[PDB]
Amino acid sequence: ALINPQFPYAGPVPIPGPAPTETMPLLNYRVEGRIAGIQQARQFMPFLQGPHRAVAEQTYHAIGTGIQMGQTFNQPLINTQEG
């Protein structure tokens, strides 16, 4: 702010002001609020809580069976070298 003498800035907005209204009042709000609809315990989703496999491992079962059977052919006898 600058004040300049001799033209000085009025020393106030004075008493000639026009009170325009008495509408100043905010009427307090008084209220009762009830949000009470029956609630049912459940919601349907496509899927909740699953941690789906991105790849599975290979998996398997097992079997064996049979017996011990055989047809054989042997090497001929040979002269013994030494000993």
């Binding site: 790849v55 290979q58 398997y60 097992a62």
Partner: protein
């Protein structure tokens, strides 16, 4: 005395048929998982014309 991996692996040949081809559009036949595909043969039976 037996090799166990050889006998628990399967070496198979299998065929299938797919349709829905359209000119200039990529027709894709997906490979399944788990299988180790050694070769692929595709025969374009173009409505009886080869």
């Amino acid at each position: 005395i037996l090799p166990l991996i050889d006998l628990s692996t399967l070496y198979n040949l299998e065929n299938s048929a797919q349709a829905g081809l359209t000119p200039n559009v990529d027709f894709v036949v997906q490979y399944a998982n788990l299988y180790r595909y050694l070769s692929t043969i595709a025969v374009f039976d173009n409505g009886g014309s080869f």
